[PDB]
Amino acid sequence: IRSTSTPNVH
Amino acid sequence: IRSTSTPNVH
Amino acid sequence: GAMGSMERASLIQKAKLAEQAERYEDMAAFMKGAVEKGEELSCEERNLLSVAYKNVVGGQRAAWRVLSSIEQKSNEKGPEVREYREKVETELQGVCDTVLGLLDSHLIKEAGDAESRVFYLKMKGDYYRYLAEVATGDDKKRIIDSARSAYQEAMDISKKEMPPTNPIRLGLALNFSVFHYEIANSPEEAISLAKTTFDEAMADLHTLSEDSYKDSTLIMQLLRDNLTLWT
Amino acid sequence: GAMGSMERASLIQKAKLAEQAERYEDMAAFMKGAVEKGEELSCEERNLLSVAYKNVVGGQRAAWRVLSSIEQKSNEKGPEVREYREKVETELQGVCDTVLGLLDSHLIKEAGDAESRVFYLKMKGDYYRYLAEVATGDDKKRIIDSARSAYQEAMDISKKEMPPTNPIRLGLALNFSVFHYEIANSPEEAISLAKTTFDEAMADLHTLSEDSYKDSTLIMQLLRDNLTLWT
Numbered sequence: 001i002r003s004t005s006t007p008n009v010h
Numbered sequence: 011i012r013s014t015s016t017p018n019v020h
Numbered sequence: 021g022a023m024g025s026m027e028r029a030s031l032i033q034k035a036k037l038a039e040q041a042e043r044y045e046d047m048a049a050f051m052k053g054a055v056e057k058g059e060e061l062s063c064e065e066r067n068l069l070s071v072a073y074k075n076v077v078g079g080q081r082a083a084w085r086v087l088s089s090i091e092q093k094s095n096e097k098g099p100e101v102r103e104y105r106e107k108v109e110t111e112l113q114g115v116c117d118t119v120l121g122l123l124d125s126h127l128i129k130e131a132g133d134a135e136s137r138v139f140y141l142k143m144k145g146d147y148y149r150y151l152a153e154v155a156t157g158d159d160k161k162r163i164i165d166s167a168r169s170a171y172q173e174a175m176d177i178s179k180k181e182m183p184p185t186n187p188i189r190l191g192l193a194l195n196f197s198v199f200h201y202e203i204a205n206s207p208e209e210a211i212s213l214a215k216t217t218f219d220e221a222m223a224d225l226h227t228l229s230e231d232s233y234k235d236s237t238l239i240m241q242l243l244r245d246n247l248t249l250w251t
Numbered sequence: 252g253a254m255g256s257m258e259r260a261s262l263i264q265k266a267k268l269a270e271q272a273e274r275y276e277d278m279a280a281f282m283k284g285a286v287e288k289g290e291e292l293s294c295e296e297r298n299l300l301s302v303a304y305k306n307v308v309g310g311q312r313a314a315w316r317v318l319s320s321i322e323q324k325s326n327e328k329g330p331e332v333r334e335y336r337e338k339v340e341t342e343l344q345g346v347c348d349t350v351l352g353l354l355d356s357h358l359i360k361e362a363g364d365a366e367s368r369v370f371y372l373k374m375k376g377d378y379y380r381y382l383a384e385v386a387t388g389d390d391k392k393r394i395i396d397s398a399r400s401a402y403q404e405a406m407d408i409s410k411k412e413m414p415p416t417n418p419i420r421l422g423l424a425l426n427f428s429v430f431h432y433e434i435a436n437s438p439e440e441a442i443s444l445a446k447t448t449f450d451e452a453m454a455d456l457h458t459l460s461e462d463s464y465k466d467s468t469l470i471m472q473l474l475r476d477n478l479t480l481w482t
């Protein structure tokens with residue numbers, strides 16, 4: 001499983 | 011609600 | 021065009037990869053390239069063509085509907101909403117024109133099995149219907165007539181040459197019924213077609229095919245769902 | 252370019268419409284146009300720029316990963332998988348180069364508030380990181396160094412000028428930690444940065460801002476999730 005980066009939300 | 015048409019199913 | 025130097029088999033292969041990668045514009049380009057080799061498409065290849073273009077035009081229709089709704093609501097204001105709706109509309113029309121062009125120049129023929137002839141005429145009806153969803157004035161009446169005529173020719177063949185549970189026959193009837201309801205403003209014709217299609221499929225349920233019964237039963241349920249919506 | 256004749260305000264308006272229509276390529280093009288007017292972007296406008304390009308490159312990364320996995324598995328064969336993977340790769344690199352070009356030519360400045368300077372340097376790190384995911388050889392070493400240098404400059408500013416719960420500071424730290432883990436093969440540095448970031452945010456939890464605390468607390472949870480994955 002890949003590390004999670006900053007999501008494309010706001 | 012729109013009528014459903016033939017879905018894009020493989 | 022851009023796919024001219026690639027082998028047909030490689031284009032089909034890449035269409036399948038693009039489908040796996042959810043790259044539907046690429047998938048459509050590969051399949052257009054394959055069509056332009058001038059050989060017939062198999063059932064499986066027609067599926068690739070169908071899935072690709074339906075995904076592309078589906079995204080455009082969805083976008084068009086959002087913008088059209090913002091536009092109508094804003095007409096109860098600068099030009100921006102109209103401009104952008106027109107941009108998306110123009111792109112959608114271009115995709116429909118491409119599909120209709122392929123159908124006319126390469127795919128629609130007097131020869132070939134019933135499935136292929138019905139499938140392509142169904143597809144012609146569908147893409148005229150998509151043009152009709154965004155059309156106005158003179159252009160619209162003409163487009164609607166073109167859609168109806170393609171569907172009706174497809175229907176005539178399907179009723180003569182295909183079992184009543186055949187998934188292409190069912191999908192055609194489903195889509196024509198949607199045309200009647202949503203485009204041609206003929207709810208009674210829509211209801212009648214959908215009911216007849218569903219009832220005749222059930223009466224001859226024994227004609228379901230081993231390799232397509234899941235598709236058949238799915239379209240039968242969609243006919244029933246529209247009948248529930250419309251009554 | 253193609254957006255040169257359109258008013259800045261109209262471009263921003265259309266970016267917002269495109270976001271609503273899920274037309275992210277259009278959204279990115281409108282925001283590039285707005286950037287090229289040569290005025291600063293607000294927080295809200297930086298968001299539009301970020302969302303648009305992240306959606307575009309996100310689709311390309313996802314597609315690249317599918318094709319790369321098919322490719323590696325098929326190397327246990329014609330050229331088609333490699334060719335198509337290369338095609339998608341080339342497009343992805345093109346988008347990253349566009350973004351990096353905008354950042355360098357227009358957006359990264361010595362002036363402006365801490366938020367803007369950190370945000371743009373973070374974005375530079377991210378798009379070098381995306382290039383690094385598909386790079387090889389000499390190109391790759393250069394790219395990784397460029398990513399690290401952008402992130403490190405952003406970190407230096409954020410620690411001096413921003414509270415430890417600031418969402419840009421947190422998101423930068425999250426993304427730099429991902430760089431360490433996934434790109435630079437430095438799990439210890441990744442873990443250490445993520446732990447320090449989370450702990451320092453908790454220690455000064457009272458610095459959460461009324462207008463961004465939801466974003467802050469979301470990134471804090473993502474730091475915790477990576478720490479759980481990595482240990």
Ligand SMILES: *CC(=O)N1CC[C@@]2(CCN(S(=O)(=O)c3ccc(Br)c(F)c3)C2)C1
Pocket residue numbers: 016017018019020062063064066067070071135136139142187188189190191192235236238239
């Ligand atoms: C054999 C053949 O020519 N086919 C089978 C698949 C397809 C491509 C799309 N259709 S359709 O539009 O007639 C249709 C789509 C979905 C479903 Br569930 C369905 F039953 C029919 C025929 C080409």
Ligand SMILES: *CC(=O)N1CC[C@@]2(CCN(S(=O)(=O)c3ccc(Br)c(F)c3)C2)C1
Pocket residue numbers: 006007008009010293294295297298301366367370373418419420421422423465466467469470
């Ligand atoms: C004020 C400002 O410049 N902003 C706010 C939104 C954004 C656009 C993307 N980021 S981010 O990448 O730093 C980030 C993304 C998501 C989340 Br939940 C987050 F906390 C930060 C800042 C530009």
Ligand SMILES: [Cl-]
Pocket residue numbers: 103104107265
């Ligand atoms: Cl426009």
Ligand SMILES: [Cl-]
Pocket residue numbers: 034334335338
């Ligand atoms: Cl290719």
Ligand SMILES: [Mg+2]
Pocket residue numbers: 026027028029057
């Ligand atoms: Mg050939």
Ligand SMILES: [Mg+2]
Pocket residue numbers: 106109
């Ligand atoms: Mg028009």
Ligand SMILES: [Mg+2]
Pocket residue numbers: 223224
């Ligand atoms: Mg009977």
Ligand SMILES: [Mg+2]
Pocket residue numbers: 255256257
């Ligand atoms: Mg100008």
Ligand SMILES: [Mg+2]
Pocket residue numbers: none
């Ligand atoms: Mg072998």
Ligand SMILES: [Mg+2]
Pocket residue numbers: 340385
């Ligand atoms: Mg390469």
Ligand SMILES: [Mg+2]
Pocket residue numbers: 436437
């Ligand atoms: Mg090491």
